[PDB]
Structure 1
Amino acid sequence: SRDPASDQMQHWKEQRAAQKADVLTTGAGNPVGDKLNVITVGPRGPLLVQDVVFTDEMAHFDRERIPERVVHAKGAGAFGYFEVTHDITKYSKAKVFEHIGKKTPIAVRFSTVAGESGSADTVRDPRGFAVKFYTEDGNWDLVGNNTPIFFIRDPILFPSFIHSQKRNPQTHLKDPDMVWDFWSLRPESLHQVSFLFSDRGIPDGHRHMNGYGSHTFKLVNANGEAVYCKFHYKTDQGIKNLSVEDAARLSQEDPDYGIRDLFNAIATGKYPSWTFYIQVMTFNQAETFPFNPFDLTKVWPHKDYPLIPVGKLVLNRNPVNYFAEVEQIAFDPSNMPPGIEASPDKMLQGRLFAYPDTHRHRLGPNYLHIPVNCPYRARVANYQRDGPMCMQDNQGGAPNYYPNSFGAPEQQPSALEHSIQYSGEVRRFNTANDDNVTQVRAFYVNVLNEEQRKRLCENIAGHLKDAQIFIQKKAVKNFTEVHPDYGSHIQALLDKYN
């Protein structure tokens, strides 16, 4: 017998040893006599409409596909739990943190970003690391990435950015001109691009990478005080990356390497886990931070903002039905329980709207009714009703209007969001020149070593070489601004390729 993943059916069959097989039926529960032949008028006669068994089955088959996630299409999933290991109640009143030892069920989905559903796992691309906490105060979705930062600092460019990362609207081909025209034109990307083209650009499976909330968030405590925070979840399996050669080879031998790896890890009991930490920055600290504490292209230096342990994330359960538990899963950053709130980070602010929006499309108006999306650890009650595919009792006959003198659900004052005062004009503040290099310099010079700097360049050049000369120069100019050697080294490599 092979790996647990390939023995799926066998095991399933074996689990129903002394069991009689179920009667094959139509979607309406009507028993089927022969689902192996269609109804024709005579052996060599035409098909009949009366064959509803056929139609019923075919019609469903003709409808099993839904739109894939506009981004992070390709992915994997697992379930497990979150466990509180440390007291951070002085920062957040969130029930999910209330007591050390408290466990909250979680659902996770790892994923690449650019490729569609049939693309490979072992390719350079950041990785999605979404977490769904089913808490008593509703679901908390920490839709993070394997990176603490991102390519841009303003939501309105995301569509374009994604467009540049995807296929040429006409040829339907990946287009390095698109990729680098955008990147060279928008140097804020410089930070994430460096991360991207480094060794961590292609993690060895999902268990060997870190997770981050990336954006700065706000934590409010029982007394109502509030501080800003960052979420970090380090792999307990340790960071491990794939060499470009192996990544390339595997992308050929097993496009689903990531899915397979995870399933077998859990299937054999090697349950992966991550240690959950947070970074805290008081309003006063934020005021004097050397950068914009909400700029997604920046990080909070550990030296200045030490990691504060919070708990453990553990995945011990594989999905039973991928489509139902993984494909259909939906995470909304806007899903925050009392104690956790949003920060003025423009990128975040954007995602606040986008996620429920896209879900209403990809999945449907009542996507939250879907089992894996349902906040089963909370009592959903409100004045919302109906909608396509209303799968529950639709809250029965409870009064559907607020306020009302008939005892329908009431709002609880203690759940009010924290309020801060802001000043200045209401307009479009440009942020294209918000220091696009400083931290990148620190990364290149202080974080990486010679060996790694070499590879990073080789990686950037290997792809960049296919872009037009003028783009190459533009890109290189920005790289030179990060550090002279960074740009020069790349250029040299380009010279050879060209």
Structure 2
Amino acid sequence: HKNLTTNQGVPVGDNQNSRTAGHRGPSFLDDYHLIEKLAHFDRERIPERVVHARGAGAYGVFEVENSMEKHTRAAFLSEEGKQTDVFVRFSTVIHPKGSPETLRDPRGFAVKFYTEEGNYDLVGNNLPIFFIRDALKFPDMVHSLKPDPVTNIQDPDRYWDFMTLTPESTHMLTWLFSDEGIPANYAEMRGSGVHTFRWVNKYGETKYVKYHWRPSEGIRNLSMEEAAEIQANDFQHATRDLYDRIEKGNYPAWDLYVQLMPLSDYDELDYDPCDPTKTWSEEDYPLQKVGRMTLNRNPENFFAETEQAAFTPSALVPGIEASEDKLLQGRLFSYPDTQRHRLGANYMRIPVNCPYAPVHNNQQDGFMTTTRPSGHINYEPNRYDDQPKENPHYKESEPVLHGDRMVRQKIEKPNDFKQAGEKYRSYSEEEKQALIKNLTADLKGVNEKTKLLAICNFYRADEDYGQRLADSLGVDIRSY
């Protein structure tokens, strides 16, 4: 047995009645319990994530099968058998916190590894490419996909406007409007790092790397009609499914694979290997197994752990570095920036975000300082040998720069249509049919000039793709 108390630690005598002028009179201001309890209630909510607002989290373990020390000095990958705790959040993208998990969207696949040399965040999605290749466009892209700012309803005319005029999107759309646009749940789902990263070994040698997560539960997708039928009765079915698997002891897992490419292959290719609208051939750059992640524990409190979880692509660890991918570059900034707003200056002290590795630095203060700071020395350099010092063993690599000027200029070899055609042609006939069906349902109401431009983009990917879509939309494209 325990007393109900105020936040001052005073036991509460009555948690049923406000203090009033007799049993039926108006309420008095001197009711600390009422005021404190209402005021805290009044302040429960914090801003939702600007994208990926809807999601679900779980803890688990990653275990190395094949050590990667020949390619990366990353401590958590250094030895067979080595286990690292993780926290993972899965999500949709566009709609708000309470929105259904049956909508078409990429799914987020955000892993925080609690390594002995710091937290490593790999902030992936299920689909392995993106719509755009420069972060400057992200707010535009998002605003086009988001509910209309007048009506609060998503409008395909808006996002198809932006996407058609951003033809690098063509490959992504070709995946998003397959039925993999609606994964059956979070467990039966791919994961991808999307970007190329740099792995740097103890000798300072660099490779390009791509990450891939392969579900032990297999990949399964929903048709539009299957998604609708689930939506009718459950708007949180993927959150449900994840919690339930774990509660039952049926732990979902993914095998981690990487591809590795020499920096010097840039000139051997007809696309930029750091363009995130591109994949790398699995034939030319085969998948190499690293290990397995198993999710085996639900959080204790959804708000404190899942809703307040903060992941950033810039939470890198020694031996793993950003590539020059311009989309990735902006992310390095935007996540910690949004997290300071959403969660507070000290969000890194929220338990789920805390490293296992020691934190020692000269940062101080900020809202909600709860860590019991002490000491006179909050600056470096200083004269004290016992105060924290830099450690040059942990310097990052020095990538070579090929440019001689500060420029704003698109990459060379953008090659916006080729891989979209290759993906189209890789689909089974059933999959192609589902693609055309999903695209047609989405495009049929949009502005005619935009609709034509969409058809033309997919035609450039593959003539059959474009012609089928034109036919299904009742657009005559003879004349182009």
Query: What range is the shorter-chain TM-score in?
Result: over 0.9
SS at match of 2:351: coil
Cα RMSD over matched residues? 1.2
Counterpart Cα distance in 1 of 2:130 and 2:294? 26
Counterpart Cα distance in 2 of 1:474 and 1:438? 17
Counterpart Cα distance in 2 of 1:172 and 1:433? 38
Aligned match for 2:447, one of 465, 468, 476: 468
SS at match of 2:474: helix
Counterpart Cα distance in 2 of 1:332 and 1:167? 25
CA contact (8 A) 1:398 1:408 kept: no
2:235 is aligned to 255
* Alignment-mate amino acid for residue 18 of structure 2: V
CA drift of 1:252 comes to 2.5
2:55 is aligned to 75
2:275 is aligned to 295
Q: Rate the CA distance shift 1:337–1:297 in 2: closer, same or farther, 3 A.
A: same
SS at match of 2:101: coil
Counterpart Cα distance in 2 of 1:99 and 1:106? 17
CA drift of 1:118 comes to 1.3
2:359 is aligned to 380
2:381 is aligned to 403
SS at match of 1:429: coil
1:482 is aligned to 461
CA drift of 1:296 comes to 0.3
CA contact (8 A) 2:270 2:413 kept: no
- 1:123-182 Cα shifts (integer Å, max 9, x gaps): 111000000001111100000000110000110000000000001111222111111101
Q: Rate the CA distance shift 1:25–1:157 in 2: closer, same or farther, 3 A.
A: same
* 1:169 corresponds to 2:133: no
CA contact (8 A) 1:180 1:471 kept: yes
CA contact (8 A) 1:78 1:109 kept: yes
Aligned match for 1:317, one of 290, 294, 297: 297
CA drift of 1:433 comes to 7.3
Q: Percent identity over the alignment?
A: 48
Counterpart Cα distance in 2 of 1:91 and 1:333? 20
Counterpart Cα distance in 2 of 1:265 and 1:336? 30
Segments of 5+ residues of structure 2 without an aligned counterpart are 476-480
CA contact (8 A) 1:338 1:417 kept: yes
* 1:241 corresponds to 2:241: no
* 1:100 corresponds to 2:94: no
* Alignment-mate amino acid for residue 389 of structure 1: M
* Alignment-mate amino acid for residue 258 of structure 1: A
CA contact (8 A) 1:153 1:431 kept: no
Alignment of 1:96-495 (within 5 A): 96-375=76-355, 377-394=356-373, 396-397=374-375, 399-406=377-384, 407-424=386-403, 425-431=405-411, 434-445=414-425, 447-495=426-474
Q: Rate the CA distance shift 1:174–1:149 in 2: closer, same or farther, 3 A.
A: same
* Alignment-mate amino acid for residue 461 of structure 1: T
TM-score (norm 2): 0.97
Segments of 5+ residues of structure 1 without an aligned counterpart are 1-19
- 1:424-464 Cα shifts (integer Å, max 9, x gaps): 2211012497111111111111x201111111011011011
SS at match of 2:438: helix
CA contact (8 A) 1:188 1:432 kept: no
CA contact (8 A) 2:270 2:415 kept: no
Q: Rate the CA distance shift 1:485–1:411 in 2: closer, same or farther, 3 A.
A: same
Counterpart Cα distance in 2 of 1:64 and 1:433? 50
Counterpart Cα distance in 2 of 1:304 and 1:410? 44
Counterpart Cα distance in 2 of 1:359 and 1:185? 31
Counterpart Cα distance in 2 of 1:463 and 1:287? 38
CA drift of 1:493 comes to 1.6
SS at match of 2:232: helix
CA contact (8 A) 2:109 2:126 kept: yes
TM-score (norm 1): 0.93
CA contact (8 A) 1:218 1:342 kept: yes
CA contact (8 A) 1:476 1:487 kept: yes
Deviates more, 1:317-326 or 1:415-424: 415-424
Counterpart Cα distance in 1 of 2:412 and 2:3? 63
SS at match of 1:422: coil
Counterpart Cα distance in 2 of 1:358 and 1:431? 27
Counterpart Cα distance in 2 of 1:370 and 1:89? 32
* Alignment-mate amino acid for residue 382 of structure 1: N
Counterpart Cα distance in 1 of 2:174 and 2:93? 17
1:59 is aligned to 39
Counterpart Cα distance in 2 of 1:430 and 1:225? 28
* Alignment-mate amino acid for residue 233 of structure 2: E
SS at match of 2:313: coil
* Alignment-mate amino acid for residue 430 of structure 2: E
2:65 is aligned to 85
1:8 is aligned to none
CA contact (8 A) 2:309 2:353 kept: yes
Aligned length: 473
Counterpart Cα distance in 1 of 2:360 and 2:207? 30
CA drift of 1:113 comes to 0.4
2:18 is aligned to 38
* Alignment-mate amino acid for residue 171 of structure 1: T
Counterpart Cα distance in 2 of 1:228 and 1:112? 28
CA drift of 1:398 comes to 5.2
CA contact (8 A) 1:152 1:296 kept: yes
Q: Rate the CA distance shift 1:171–1:180 in 2: closer, same or farther, 3 A.
A: same
Counterpart Cα distance in 1 of 2:183 and 2:89? 15
CA drift of 1:311 comes to 0.6
CA contact (8 A) 2:71 2:199 kept: yes
